[PDB]
Amino acid sequence: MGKRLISQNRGRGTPTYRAPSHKYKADLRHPRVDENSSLRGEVVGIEHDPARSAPIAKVAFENGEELFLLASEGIAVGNIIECGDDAEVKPGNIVPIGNVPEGFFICNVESKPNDGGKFVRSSGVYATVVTHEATRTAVSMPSGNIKWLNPKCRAVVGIVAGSGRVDRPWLKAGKKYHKMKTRAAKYPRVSAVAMNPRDHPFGGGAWKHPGKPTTVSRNAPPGRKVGLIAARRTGMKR
RNA sequence: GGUGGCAAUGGCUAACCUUUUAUCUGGGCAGCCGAAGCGAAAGCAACAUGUGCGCAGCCUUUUGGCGAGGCACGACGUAUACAAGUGCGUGGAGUCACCGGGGUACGACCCGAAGCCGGGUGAUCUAGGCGUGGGCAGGUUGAAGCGUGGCGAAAGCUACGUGGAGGACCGUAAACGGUAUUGAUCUGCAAAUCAUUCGUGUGACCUGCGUCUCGUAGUGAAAUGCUAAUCUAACCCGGCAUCCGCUGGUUCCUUCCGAAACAUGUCGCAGCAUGACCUGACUUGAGAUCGUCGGUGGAGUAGAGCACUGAUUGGCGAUUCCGGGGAUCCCUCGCUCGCUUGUCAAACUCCAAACCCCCCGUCAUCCUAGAAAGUCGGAGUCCGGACUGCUGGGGUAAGCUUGUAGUCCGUAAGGGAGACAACCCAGCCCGUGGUUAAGGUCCCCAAGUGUCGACUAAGUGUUAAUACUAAAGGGCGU
RNA sequence: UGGGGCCCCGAAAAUUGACGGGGCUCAAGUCGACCACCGAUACCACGGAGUACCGCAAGGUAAUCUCGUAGGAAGGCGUUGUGUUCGGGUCGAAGCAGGGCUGUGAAGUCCUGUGGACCGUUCACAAACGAAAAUCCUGGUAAUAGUAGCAGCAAAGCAGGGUGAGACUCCCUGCCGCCGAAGGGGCCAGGUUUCCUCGGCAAUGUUCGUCAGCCGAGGGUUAGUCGGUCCUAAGACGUACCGUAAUUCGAGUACGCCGAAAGGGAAACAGGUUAAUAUUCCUGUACCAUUUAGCGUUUAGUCUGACGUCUCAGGGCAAGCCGAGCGGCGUCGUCGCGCCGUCUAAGCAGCGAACCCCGUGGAGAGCCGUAAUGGCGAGAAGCGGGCGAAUCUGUAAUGGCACAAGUCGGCUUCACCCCGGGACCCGUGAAAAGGACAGCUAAAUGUCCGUACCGAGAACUGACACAGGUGCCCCUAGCUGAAAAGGCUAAGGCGUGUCGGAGUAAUUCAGUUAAGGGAAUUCGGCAAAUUAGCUCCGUAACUUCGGGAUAAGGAGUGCCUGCUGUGUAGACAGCAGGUCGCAGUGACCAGGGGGCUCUAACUGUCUAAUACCAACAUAGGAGAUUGCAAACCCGUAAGGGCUAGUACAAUCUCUGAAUCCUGCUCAGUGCAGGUACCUGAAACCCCGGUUCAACGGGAAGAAGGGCCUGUAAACAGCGGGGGUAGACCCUCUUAAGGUAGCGUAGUACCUUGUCGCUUAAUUGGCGACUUGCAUGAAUGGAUCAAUGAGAGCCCUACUGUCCCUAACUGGAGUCCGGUGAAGCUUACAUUCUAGUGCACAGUCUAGAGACCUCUAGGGGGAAGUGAAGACCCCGUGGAGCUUUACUGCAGCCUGUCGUUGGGUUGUGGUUCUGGAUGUACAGUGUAGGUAGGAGGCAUCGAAGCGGGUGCGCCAGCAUUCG
RNA sequence: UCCUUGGUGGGGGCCAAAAAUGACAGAAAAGUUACCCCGGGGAUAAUUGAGUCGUUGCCGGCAAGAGUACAUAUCGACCCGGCAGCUUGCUACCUCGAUGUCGGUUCUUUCCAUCCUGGCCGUGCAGCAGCGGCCAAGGGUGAGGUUGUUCGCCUAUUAAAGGAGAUCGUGAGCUGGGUUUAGACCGUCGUGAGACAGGUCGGUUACUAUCUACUAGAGGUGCCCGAGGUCUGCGGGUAAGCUGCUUUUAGUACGAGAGGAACCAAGCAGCGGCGCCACUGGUGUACCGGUUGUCUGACAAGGCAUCGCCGGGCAGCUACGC
């Protein structure tokens, strides 16, 4: 048994690959709201989120609950965030995406209604509302795909704060090391051709090279799905 | 196999009971083997001797007779299903023990690895993640930002001060690391340390304590590195007395005999089986052939030869042929075919030995104190080597390699060659005496300064064989 | 002239050697013959043993018997025990040492001594039954050998006097020394009595020992305040649920519970006392918590606990320093200096710097601040107030000090305390208990555990009294100096772990110096040497504009006298003059530099114990999957990692900073998409078979495959020969035929390729050329400032690297006292030459040498020792790894069945009503199915007609609207 | 013939034929290891050793001929016969319970097939100087650049800068550059792991001497009137030195000139050997002085810092001196 790969170690869940969950502030999700209800809260602080490297807003709601929310661009302390079917379509409010006009920018989008917010959550970029239909609403993702979601799916109006974070080059190994200290990801990473054959399919040889094509079938079992997984194509665009 | 019990109206019991404490006595017929074989099966189913030879033994006129056992036939059962031939079987000897040998399976004469697998142990070391602490002498450099001032029409350009950034610089025997000396040490202070010299030394930094991640798993800035002096799969115990054709060992005496290192098959080539060869016993009962001489047969090797197959050298004579050279093919002429010369052959033979082989007779030797033959028990052995021949084959040759006949060493003493596995005498129970073999006789060293006739002047030589001994050529040396 | 014998030339090898050696010449050589003798275990003779065969025996025969490995066969000896026969022994059994006799022998018996209670023997039977070997095992014990070691630690001791049987080694005094930012002080983990006292010295201590961490006996650890205990952290454990064939196994959830002697935290100090404990006992002076009783009560939910890195201001302070007085000690050749001390806890009371806040104020052709950033009509300066520190002041005062003084000032102040500012993000830097906000008084209570001592060059760990390692300190005094570097000294701890020694030779480990030369040494400047601090001047190519840089290259530097400037000060900077030495960073400390290349961008990581590299990583660049009930991955499952995440994200790969770039090839393999057609298992269905099935076919057809398309920053490839001043049309092209670059390379076999510089000379380096055996673009190409314990070459300086060694220093060695191992070993052994021999002999053969013993010395030989060769082969021995080797198994894709229900339609017949609708030719009439081969109905029904209700040839049967 | 009996469908068997195992007396079967492990083997390879000598080095016989003529001053074709074992092969006898692998360095020794030095002979030898051969192994045979090199090339001296053997002498002497481990790069192979008598960077050299041998120093015993002194010399060893330059002979012999010798004589030099220390140089941790930092209160006198450092230096030892 040529040793298990890094992916198999991560699946095992050893401490080297676990997230430092104690370092994080909150599990950011939309406040739970009953059917046909609303709640208003005020932003009391803008804090740094170590799990995202983006700002988060601390919000005190009317019901006595203090909650961390994914902060949108321009959200400020003292702002009144409303969450409900009747909420004003304004930056920071939590409204169903059926009430958002086409061409509007949303973020923290629920995959299903009441899900808490799944899509469009990293620092800076957004989703666009494209079309509206009776049971379906279409949004262009940051990927470029079109996602048809329930119009009752909730989302905060605006973009995620922290745009341009990756614009500054890392410039330095330790610069990225300090970011990797707060995440589960292993840093740094050894190239597979630098390993021995027992450690990777690409390892070994008198000279560094994979020895086999790097595009691997989608049917390959765990321990073999390495390189370019089910690649539609390869190379730089012609 | 040796010794026994019983014996075709066969042998023995197993479990078990009888124990009165494992014995023992008497029971115990279930079963097994024998008693009928052949055939896949269905199935069918044989000699209580028809004949001959003949050992022992007996009788006998010493040549014959009877002749158990034995041998050879004949006959019959069944399968081959048509037939014919043939196979197996058939005229009652087995069975159960004790003491032995041997095969097979089991740890299987004893020890000897790496490994494979099960369940457990380990992150006090080391690697990495996390929590919470500690640490980094003293200096250097001087980013942005800010103040003031210059040069400019502005655009803008620019000096100094302040400021204190950086996986920045120097540097501590703080800490961490480990370059070079390939220094010390190298049964050490130390199962890797010491001295000097070096790299990092505000950061991907070092480090305490705590905690987590581990065996086909972990960890790894990736070397197959590290995971408790153990890492290309840790350690403990278990499978396990693993297995091996491979290595090592295997313990008292005498006596009798005494090999094979070879063939065929083998995933066989360091092994094994079968056979040859050794050994023991029994059966049988009259011949056998290691040697000689003569004869009937086989020769196709040596040698010889050119008569076949092919080579091969000139001379001579012809092919008015097939062909090389400068219009009547105007004439020059190599091969081809013969008579003579000169040479040849593993795979040529008109010839043709000596050895040798089969058979017959003969002598010779052995043999009823058991020929030849048969049956059974036990093996070892299939690494060989050498000398003398075969111009053995191959090779430039080889103390090379591979054959063959004999004999040796192996397993062979003693005597002699300086010593010498296998070269000479000789095969050798113990003691004594004598005479010899090989070889030697100037001394070492037992016996010749032996005899005769010559040669050698070179210390040549003083060397049977042997791989341990120098050639071609020349010499008015003798 | 030919044929012959012997000899000569031809004829050269390596330690001194071989006719066996001496030697030998009408021979002691050769040739032809001969004579006598010597000389085996052969042969003969005698005697004896065994063997084979025969014989009833007695005995007979053997020229035709007597070697022997593997191996077969026969008979015996011995050990221990069993049955059985017969015995021996305290008047001395077994065993043991030595000896006699017998037997071929295995062995038996006896004698002497020793020993003190058991032992044999006949015939048989058994076995845990016989040893010289296994790098055999266990135990004991040699040679080595009185040898190595008791030497870097680190200057290590000496004198005098004691103690004692005994003294280098134990005690005291003095002198001389070591460490002195650790070798001192405190303490974690760990140790576990090593701590203290007394008495010892058999062992331990690397010597001795009276000493001791050793031996024996006794003693020693005192807590409301110091820790644990309490809280929670990463993260464990328990119960429940669920899984699992099951569990002591398993993830998650819920509830609990633990998890820090360095995180948080209620509170105590000074002095004394013992031989050893002391914030613990005693004295004095305090403080905290609950509980009880009384006196009063919420402000309630906030704050605190509670936080990173770097940098800086202000204030304070332990330590430190200076001057005066006082009290001791030292010195005193002269002087009057030097050293020590000159003390004082918590608690209690008092003040309060900065920040912040409150009231006034009104500030701009701008004002106020800071070290710095800054602040301001959204309200500056100024003026009042509140809140609020370290520390300081008093008290605690009649404690300890020689009841000796004990009183004052000043400076500085880290590395400690308080407070405030700024910068960075890239880790945004914990939680909970507890505390505060309403408590005051008085009594009682405050349990349990630890507490000695070491904390390391002797108390831990590494087997050790081990030169390593082990938490470290938020521990460390004076001078020099930037300094905690180095040197010299305090305090404190030590002389603690073998001595002596006469030149103490040679040699060796580590150092000092070295004429002239200066890398000629060597693979190579390895090693050593040079330089070195600070100040000032000055600083190149190149460059990514940051740097290179301390580049390079120059000058100064000590002491004394008198001063100047900055600053509140500490101090710092500078000046003038005088002056000594070979030398002024005088010791200590402390870069050598430059030029040309390769390579990697850089800092970093690594083979703990041979590889610190160009390898790994890195930032940067590119590609791929995935919209989250995702991609990818773990688990048998329950359920998980990534994930308290969401494309700017995670995961999977390649390349490897910047700069200029990254060309052509999709034939092969891979990947993705498409599936028109072909192939494609099972189930269902159909046919046949089967009294039923098995079975044989058919249909349909998923995934997959064939097949088509795309894709090279996927794996990869980018080629042969000949006509033309080696270009160009063709080729060979079974996809294409090397673009930019680079090139004898870290790739170039030929090869020491050719030329130029570098040298006297260069298989070298660099540059150019390049016919590239076999360069080339993210299998990344070229190039590159800076960086580098990387790899080469050159220049300079330097030198014992060398020419070529010498002297000296300390430690070993040598000699002496004490202590005291280990490793090679079948035996013998004073060897040397040659030959022989398994062809590499101290032992064989023939010679030559050699009197023995001891000491020192370097290593020729003992094919020296260490070690079942790691190179090679073999073994139907292993292990890992690879793959289009064989065979499988997981994972994944897909069909079918179950889970799995209800509706709507589209597809096959399931099942049957209204007609028997049936008709080449003509029909009066439709075969009214094949039919009693003929025979029943009817105005209470039999037809010529409408689109003719079944049907059809606008006919005609059934009587229906007529 | 098919399990109680009979039958059906379907099986099993007997004899024969066909289908193949070519590794053909019949397994269904690809690699790699330098990350390797284990058991053995000198039954079998790298290396030294033994044999052989094709090959290599050095020769010989006959002399074909060349040499203005003339085989033999010089060269030596064709063929033939050898020696050595120093090149490379062949072989597998010894060693796989290890005989440490190349090259260099240090030190010793041997061979002659002689490079120089000594003595000779021939010459197509006038002299100078060559060419060829014979004897001769006493001495010498060096210094440097590249390369790990052996070998080879090159440089300047030199009388010449010969070759070879000693386990390709010499790792219980040294070195570690090369080759021969584990890491890594480049190129080429291979799909790959990996490989390359291709290149490149890096990469642990253990031991206290038992015996023997040698170098030196002692104690004995033997020999011997007891002791002492002085000698002899059986023997052993030696390189009881080797070799250049210059002057002279002599600008002579010789030669037409150019050029240009020899005997004898002298001095000097290189290397070697032996000894010595007046001179000169080094060292000189005896000693003397200067001075930095610090301590002993200052001065003086002292300690320490490598002898603190720096300067000088007698004796002694030494060579770079004699």
XYZ file of all heavy atoms in Angstrom, chain C residues 893-909:
364
model
P -21.001 6.763 -8.841
O -21.618 8.112 -8.792
O -21.564 5.677 -8.000
O -21.009 6.281 -10.360
C -20.656 7.165 -11.413
C -20.780 6.496 -12.760
O -19.823 5.411 -12.872
C -22.121 5.838 -13.042
O -23.106 6.753 -13.482
C -21.765 4.791 -14.085
O -21.649 5.370 -15.376
C -20.384 4.350 -13.616
N -20.432 3.146 -12.754
C -20.612 1.883 -13.324
O -20.751 1.799 -14.552
N -20.635 0.792 -12.521
C -20.481 0.927 -11.205
N -20.508 -0.163 -10.437
C -20.296 2.198 -10.602
C -20.274 3.264 -11.404
P -24.611 6.645 -12.934
O -25.322 7.864 -13.393
O -24.587 6.318 -11.486
O -25.227 5.404 -13.719
C -25.388 5.445 -15.128
C -25.472 4.065 -15.731
O -24.291 3.282 -15.403
C -26.617 3.202 -15.235
O -27.871 3.547 -15.802
C -26.141 1.809 -15.606
O -26.315 1.552 -16.988
C -24.646 1.916 -15.304
N -24.329 1.396 -13.954
C -24.370 0.025 -13.831
O -24.645 -0.710 -14.763
N -24.107 -0.474 -12.589
C -23.796 0.254 -11.463
O -23.573 -0.345 -10.410
C -23.767 1.674 -11.657
C -24.036 2.181 -12.867
P -29.238 3.250 -15.005
O -30.266 4.173 -15.546
O -28.972 3.256 -13.545
O -29.660 1.765 -15.407
C -29.986 1.435 -16.748
C -30.185 -0.049 -16.935
O -28.976 -0.777 -16.593
C -31.256 -0.676 -16.055
O -32.565 -0.479 -16.558
C -30.839 -2.137 -16.019
O -31.236 -2.812 -17.204
C -29.316 -2.015 -16.002
N -28.742 -2.065 -14.645
C -28.091 -1.037 -14.018
N -27.633 -1.347 -12.840
C -27.979 -2.678 -12.691
C -27.752 -3.556 -11.607
O -27.182 -3.321 -10.539
N -28.269 -4.817 -11.856
C -28.927 -5.185 -13.001
N -29.352 -6.455 -13.045
N -29.152 -4.375 -14.022
C -28.644 -3.145 -13.804
P -33.807 -0.333 -15.549
O -35.040 -0.181 -16.362
O -33.463 0.693 -14.533
O -33.882 -1.746 -14.819
C -34.232 -2.914 -15.543
C -34.197 -4.138 -14.668
O -32.834 -4.405 -14.245
C -34.972 -4.057 -13.363
O -36.362 -4.268 -13.525
C -34.289 -5.113 -12.514
O -34.717 -6.418 -12.876
C -32.836 -4.936 -12.937
N -32.070 -4.023 -12.055
C -31.643 -4.497 -10.830
O -31.900 -5.618 -10.429
N -30.923 -3.601 -10.078
C -30.585 -2.310 -10.426
O -29.923 -1.619 -9.651
C -31.051 -1.894 -11.711
C -31.756 -2.746 -12.458
P -37.408 -3.578 -12.521
O -38.774 -3.838 -13.041
O -36.982 -2.180 -12.262
O -37.238 -4.407 -11.171
C -37.494 -5.803 -11.144
C -37.173 -6.412 -9.802
O -35.738 -6.429 -9.581
C -37.709 -5.670 -8.592
O -39.094 -5.884 -8.381
C -36.815 -6.193 -7.479
O -37.199 -7.500 -7.080
C -35.470 -6.269 -8.202
N -34.658 -5.044 -8.013
C -33.917 -4.893 -6.841
O -33.973 -5.793 -5.991
N -33.176 -3.773 -6.669
C -33.152 -2.834 -7.615
N -32.410 -1.744 -7.414
C -33.897 -2.963 -8.817
C -34.629 -4.070 -8.967
P -39.970 -4.751 -7.655
O -41.372 -5.228 -7.568
O -39.682 -3.454 -8.318
O -39.377 -4.690 -6.180
C -39.566 -5.767 -5.273
C -38.880 -5.497 -3.959
O -37.450 -5.363 -4.152
C -39.275 -4.205 -3.269
O -40.511 -4.288 -2.585
C -38.091 -3.954 -2.349
O -38.170 -4.753 -1.177
C -36.929 -4.447 -3.212
N -36.209 -3.378 -3.928
C -36.272 -3.084 -5.267
N -35.477 -2.108 -5.612
C -34.836 -1.751 -4.434
C -33.864 -0.751 -4.179
O -33.353 0.039 -4.982
N -33.484 -0.726 -2.838
C -33.984 -1.561 -1.869
N -33.508 -1.400 -0.625
N -34.892 -2.494 -2.095
C -35.268 -2.534 -3.389
P -41.473 -3.006 -2.545
O -42.722 -3.374 -1.833
O -41.552 -2.466 -3.925
O -40.687 -1.962 -1.635
C -40.338 -2.256 -0.289
C -39.381 -1.224 0.255
O -38.141 -1.252 -0.486
C -39.856 0.215 0.158
O -40.704 0.554 1.240
C -38.549 1.003 0.141
O -38.055 1.198 1.458
C -37.611 0.047 -0.601
N -37.442 0.345 -2.044
C -36.373 1.130 -2.441
O -35.562 1.604 -1.666
N -36.270 1.331 -3.793
C -37.110 0.848 -4.771
O -36.885 1.126 -5.949
C -38.192 0.047 -4.288
C -38.309 -0.175 -2.975
P -41.896 1.613 1.061
O -41.313 2.957 0.825
O -42.849 1.407 2.180
O -42.619 1.144 -0.276
C -43.832 1.753 -0.697
C -43.991 1.736 -2.196
O -43.178 2.796 -2.772
C -43.565 0.446 -2.897
O -44.406 0.213 -4.025
C -42.158 0.777 -3.379
O -41.717 0.013 -4.481
C -42.302 2.251 -3.738
N -41.040 3.007 -3.703
C -40.427 3.354 -4.897
O -40.865 3.072 -5.999
N -39.257 4.055 -4.759
C -38.650 4.437 -3.584
O -37.593 5.068 -3.632
C -39.338 4.044 -2.394
C -40.483 3.362 -2.497
P -45.777 -0.617 -3.878
O -45.682 -1.516 -2.701
O -46.081 -1.183 -5.217
O -46.879 0.486 -3.563
C -46.953 1.691 -4.307
C -47.802 2.713 -3.596
O -46.973 3.799 -3.107
C -48.853 3.400 -4.452
O -50.022 2.617 -4.615
C -49.082 4.705 -3.703
O -49.924 4.509 -2.576
C -47.667 5.022 -3.218
N -46.930 5.869 -4.170
C -45.798 5.492 -4.847
N -45.341 6.419 -5.635
C -46.227 7.470 -5.468
C -46.236 8.746 -6.072
O -45.425 9.189 -6.890
N -47.306 9.517 -5.629
C -48.252 9.109 -4.720
N -49.215 9.993 -4.420
N -48.254 7.913 -4.150
C -47.219 7.152 -4.568
P -50.795 2.607 -6.023
O -51.843 1.559 -5.937
O -49.793 2.549 -7.119
O -51.519 4.023 -6.088
C -52.456 4.419 -5.095
C -52.980 5.808 -5.360
O -51.945 6.791 -5.109
C -53.417 6.079 -6.793
O -54.719 5.596 -7.069
C -53.285 7.591 -6.903
O -54.406 8.249 -6.333
C -52.056 7.854 -6.032
N -50.800 7.923 -6.798
C -49.810 6.973 -6.791
N -48.785 7.294 -7.527
C -49.114 8.539 -8.041
C -48.384 9.382 -8.911
O -47.272 9.173 -9.406
N -49.075 10.556 -9.187
C -50.315 10.874 -8.691
N -50.825 12.054 -9.068
N -51.006 10.094 -7.874
C -50.347 8.952 -7.588
P -55.251 5.529 -8.582
O -56.599 4.907 -8.572
O -54.176 4.944 -9.422
O -55.418 7.056 -8.999
C -55.805 7.405 -10.318
C -55.576 8.868 -10.595
O -54.367 9.312 -9.926
C -55.362 9.239 -12.056
O -56.585 9.394 -12.756
C -54.550 10.521 -11.962
O -55.386 11.637 -11.693
C -53.683 10.243 -10.734
N -52.358 9.680 -11.059
C -51.839 8.516 -10.544
N -50.631 8.258 -10.962
C -50.329 9.321 -11.798
C -49.155 9.590 -12.543
O -48.127 8.909 -12.612
N -49.266 10.776 -13.261
C -50.367 11.596 -13.257
N -50.295 12.705 -14.006
N -51.465 11.361 -12.561
C -51.376 10.218 -11.854
P -56.900 8.540 -14.082
O -58.375 8.521 -14.247
O -56.161 7.253 -14.041
O -56.299 9.428 -15.260
C -56.748 10.761 -15.456
C -55.728 11.594 -16.188
O -54.493 11.639 -15.432
C -55.314 11.083 -17.559
O -56.233 11.478 -18.564
C -53.930 11.692 -17.745
O -54.014 13.030 -18.213
C -53.392 11.702 -16.312
N -52.450 10.601 -15.999
C -51.219 10.617 -16.622
O -50.906 11.463 -17.440
N -50.373 9.596 -16.276
C -50.622 8.585 -15.371
O -49.759 7.732 -15.154
C -51.909 8.641 -14.752
C -52.752 9.628 -15.074
P -57.433 10.513 -19.028
O -58.661 11.346 -19.054
O -57.420 9.262 -18.228
O -57.064 10.146 -20.532
C -55.960 9.307 -20.824
C -54.891 10.051 -21.581
O -53.881 10.522 -20.650
C -54.116 9.233 -22.604
O -54.775 9.157 -23.855
C -52.780 9.957 -22.665
O -52.870 11.132 -23.458
C -52.595 10.359 -21.201
N -51.879 9.333 -20.404
C -50.566 9.054 -20.726
O -49.976 9.601 -21.640
N -49.970 8.102 -19.948
C -50.521 7.411 -18.892
O -49.837 6.581 -18.292
C -51.878 7.751 -18.608
C -52.488 8.680 -19.351
P -54.655 7.835 -24.758
O -55.435 8.060 -26.001
O -54.962 6.664 -23.898
O -53.113 7.770 -25.152
C -52.521 8.747 -25.995
C -51.102 8.369 -26.343
O -50.268 8.441 -25.161
C -50.906 6.950 -26.856
O -51.209 6.835 -28.236
C -49.451 6.664 -26.513
O -48.578 7.215 -27.488
C -49.283 7.432 -25.202
N -49.440 6.589 -24.003
C -50.504 6.608 -23.133
N -50.365 5.786 -22.132
C -49.126 5.200 -22.344
C -48.437 4.222 -21.586
O -48.807 3.674 -20.540
N -47.204 3.906 -22.151
C -46.703 4.460 -23.304
N -45.497 4.034 -23.704
N -47.339 5.372 -24.022
C -48.534 5.696 -23.486
P -50.747 5.548 -29.081
O -49.267 5.539 -29.200
O -51.562 5.521 -30.322
O -51.197 4.315 -28.181
C -50.906 2.985 -28.580
C -49.451 2.653 -28.377
O -48.961 3.335 -27.185
C -49.144 1.180 -28.124
O -49.024 0.418 -29.314
C -47.870 1.240 -27.304
O -46.745 1.507 -28.131
C -48.143 2.465 -26.434
N -48.860 2.140 -25.172
C -48.267 1.294 -24.250
O -47.186 0.762 -24.428
N -48.999 1.042 -23.120
C -50.233 1.564 -22.799
O -50.769 1.255 -21.734
C -50.782 2.446 -23.780
C -50.094 2.695 -24.897
P -50.053 -0.777 -29.623
O -49.979 -1.064 -31.079
O -51.374 -0.429 -29.042
O -49.467 -2.000 -28.779
C -48.788 -3.090 -29.395
C -49.148 -4.400 -28.740
O -48.761 -4.353 -27.344
C -50.628 -4.751 -28.713
O -51.066 -5.362 -29.917
C -50.750 -5.642 -27.481
O -50.397 -6.986 -27.774
C -49.696 -5.048 -26.549
N -50.267 -4.084 -25.589
C -51.222 -3.117 -25.806
N -51.507 -2.427 -24.737
C -50.696 -2.975 -23.754
C -50.555 -2.642 -22.386
O -51.136 -1.763 -21.738
N -49.619 -3.457 -21.764
C -48.900 -4.456 -22.362
N -48.043 -5.122 -21.575
N -49.020 -4.776 -23.635
C -49.934 -4.004 -24.261
P -52.405 -6.255 -29.951
O -52.844 -6.341 -31.366
O -53.344 -5.728 -28.930
O -51.922 -7.709 -29.503
C -52.864 -8.713 -29.149
C -52.893 -8.946 -27.658
O -52.787 -7.671 -26.978
C -54.168 -9.565 -27.103
O -54.188 -10.980 -27.196
C -54.191 -9.060 -25.667
O -53.357 -9.847 -24.828
C -53.571 -7.674 -25.809
N -54.574 -6.596 -25.904
C -55.489 -6.385 -26.907
N -56.226 -5.325 -26.715
C -55.767 -4.799 -25.515
C -56.181 -3.650 -24.791
O -57.072 -2.840 -25.075
N -55.441 -3.484 -23.623
C -54.432 -4.316 -23.204
N -53.829 -3.995 -22.050
N -54.037 -5.387 -23.870
C -54.739 -5.565 -25.010
